[PDB]
Each structure stands twice: as C-alpha cells, then as structure tokens.
C-alpha cells in the first residue's frame, strides 16, 4: 500500500535484495522510554483533601477535552491547553498529578 509510504516514514529494507519489507511507525528514543512506564500510586482521589476547590477546577480543564468535546462544540470556544501548579513545597504538586495519572 505505497500510499502509506509518506516521504519521511521509516521502513525495513532487505539485507540482500534491499527492497522494502515492512514499514515502521517511529523511533521512541529510549531516554524517554522510562518516562512512560511507571505506576503513580494506584490512588483514587481519596489520599487527598482540603483542596477540592482546586482539584475540581483542574479536573475541569483537562478531563473535558479528552472525554466530552460536545460541550466545547456547542459553545464557540477552542478547547484549552494545560495549566500550572505553583505554591510552597508540601501541598500536593506531585500527588495531585499522581491522582490524575
């Protein structure tokens, strides 16, 4: 299916015939392989408290475009980009991302 051979894809050539056997999606450069395979905490928003005004507001901006885009097509708005966590060390900031992951 030569239409799938876009100019810049990755293929696997024969050793002797040198023709294309099977194409490949993309390299994943193992420096970032370890940046995916890890378990957060198996948490369920129950190891967190006193932050529910800020927890839900962060769950509002992230969970809606990845689940419910119909609420963003009915209103003439572009779905938003990411947020920021700032403050003194000790109140969440890692467990909160551990919750949403």
């Amino acid at each position: 299916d030569k239409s799938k051979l876009k100019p810049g894809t990755r293929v696997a050539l024969d050793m002797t015939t040198l023709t294309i056997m099977r194409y490949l999606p993309r390299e994943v450069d193992p420096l970032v392989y370890n940046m995916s395979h890890e378990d957060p905490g198996n948490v369920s928003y129950s190891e967190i408290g006193g932050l529910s005004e800020q927890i839900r507001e962060l769950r509002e901006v992230i969970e809606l475009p990845l689940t419910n885009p119909e609420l963003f097509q009915r209103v003439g708005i572009i779905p938003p980009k990411g947020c920021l966590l700032y403050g003194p060390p000790g109140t969440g900031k890692t467990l909160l991302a551990r919750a949403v992951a």
Partner: protein, 304 residues
C-alpha cells in the same frame, strides 16, 4: 410534598449542584443525588438541562455489580429524553441495555416488556449500516418467537416478502388494539400526537423500504403503478421521491411528461464494453477450462 411547585424546587437545586461537589464523588449517594434533578427538569420541559447533567454520568461505568435500581431509572429517563427528538437507534441501544439488567432475577413478565420494546421499532431507525448488524443480532435467538411481532420483523427484512401497508394495517391491528398482555404496545403506539407521528413514521419507513426494493428489482415503471402500489396519491409520491433523491440515498430519476421513473443510469461506452469483455472472459474461459477437465476426470470413473 407541599405542592408540585415545579419552578421553585427546580432552580433551587441547580444552584446547589455546583456546591456539594467537594465531598468526593461516591459511587452510590453522589450518583443518586445527581439523577434526582434531571427527572424534575424533564417535567418542566427543560431538555437542555437534563442532557448535560446526564452527560456527566458516563464516567461511572460498571456500577451495576452491587446495585440494580440505579441503571434502570437512569435509562428510563434517557429513553424519554431522546424520545422528544428523533434518532431512534439511541433508544434501541437503551432498550437493549434494560433487557439484560432485570433478567438476572429471571423476570417472568418484565423480561417480556423489555423484549417487546426492542423488537417493536428497529426499522424506525435510519438504515445506514447500523440497522444491518442490529437486525442480525437481535434476531435468530432462542427466546424471541413467542410473539408474532418476530414474524412481523422477519417480513420486513428484505426482498419485500409480499409487503403492503394496507395489508399491514389490517392484519396486525389486533396487536395494536387490545390483546392478551399488550403492555408495551399501548406504550409506544396508539396514543396522543406522540403516537400518531409514530404511525406516520412507521408509514414513512415502510415506503422507504418499498422504494429500495423497486430500484433493485426493476428498471422502469410507470408513475401510475408506483402511486397505486404505495397506497397514496401521485403528488405525495413525487414529493417523497424528491426528498430521497436530494438526500442522495435512493439513486433514480423521474419523468413528468410520460411518467416513466427509471432506475438504471446511462452507462459509459468505456464502462459498457469493459463489462462486456468481463462477462466474456470469466464466463467463457474459466468454466471452459472446467468442462475439459471434468470430462477428463470422468474418464477414470467410467472406464473401466
């Protein structure tokens, strides 16, 4: 409990659904409280409110393991919400999902009503590709033939199976009138203007089935024959076909000067000669090879 004041309690709970989100979203009590206000908003004809507070509920799945009276009253409001608009396949998907939930307690009668709700209107949904596998999955089961509506279903599959709406309204009216059980039959058809439109849409779906069988099993037909075979006038027959051809769903072309609606197309001389040689090649070479080799194979069995 004081009155059915439908304006005071409705707006005063929508202004507090934003409030107690801060207690964590518990699997039962939070879910039961958030389904309470949608049946209120269905009652005061606030349909824009109900479909959004119900759109949140899909993040809680597979919650029917511990309770059973949760998924029933959820879908019973979802079938009514999509009832006011069209798109009948979504009510069928909800009807099939309320078909296996009470049945786990071996319902003697409630299992029959959920069976009747599914099998009643599947033809009423639009036919694109999703009616095709749906009528292949809900049919051919061990427990469906207890009702003659399965024979009504099997008649409206395809190949016309000798269908006519005047014949259809006269033999199955007892199913539409009072019968033995007849409990979902009054619930869907035989009602106020909600039900009367469903007569028209059932009339609309059978003639849409009757146009598709004509365009496949005919080439040309006079317009007087098509009008009398659809039990309606010549003006409605033209306007109904004009609705289909601008919808690019039935592919034909009429004549209002001699009355010949034809069904084929002017074929191309490149296309026609290629289809000539293709029926020349695969019908006079492959089987021609086969005639020689079976006659060679009969040389062994016959002699000696």
């Amino acid at each position: 409990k004081e009155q059915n004041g439908d304006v005071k309690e409705a707006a005063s709970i929508l202004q507090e659904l934003q409030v107690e989100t801060y207690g964590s979203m518990e699997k039962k009590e939070r879910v039961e409280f958030i389904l309470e206000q949608m049946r209120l908003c269905l009652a005061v004809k606030d349909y824009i409110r109900t479909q959004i507070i119900s759109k949140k509920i899909n993040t809680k799945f597979f919650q029917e393991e511990n309770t059973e009276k949760l998924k029933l009253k959820y879908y019973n409001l979802m079938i009514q919400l999509d009832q006011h608009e069209g798109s009948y396949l979504s009510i069928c998907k909800h009807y099939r999902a309320i078909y296996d939930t009470p049945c786990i307690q071996a319902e003697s009668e409630k299992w029959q009503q959920a069976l009747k709700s599914v099998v009643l209107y599947v033809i009423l949904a639009p036919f694109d590709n999703e009616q095709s596998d749906l009528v292949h999955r809900i049919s051919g089961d061990k427990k469906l033939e207890e009702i003659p509506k399965y024979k009504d279903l099997l008649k409206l599959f395809t190949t016309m199976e000798l269908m006519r709406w005047s014949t259809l309204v006269e033999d199955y009216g007892m199913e539409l009138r009072k019968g033995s059980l007849e409990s979902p039959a009054t619930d869907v058809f035989g009602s106020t203007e909600e039900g009367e439109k469903r007569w028209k849409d059932l009339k609309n779906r059978v003639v849409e089935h009757n146009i598709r069988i004509m365009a496949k099993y005919y080439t040309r037909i006079t317009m007087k024959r098509m009008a009398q075979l659809l039990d309606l006038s010549v003006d409605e027959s033209e306007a109904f076909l004009s609705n289909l051809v601008v919808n690019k769903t039935i592919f034909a072309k009429v004549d209002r000067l001699a009355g010949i609606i034809n069904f084929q197309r002017p074929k191309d001389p490149n296309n026609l000669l290629n289809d000539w040689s293709q029926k020349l090649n695969s019908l006079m070479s492959l089987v021609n090879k086969t005639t020689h080799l079976i006659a060679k194979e009969e040389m062994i069995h016959n002699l000696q």
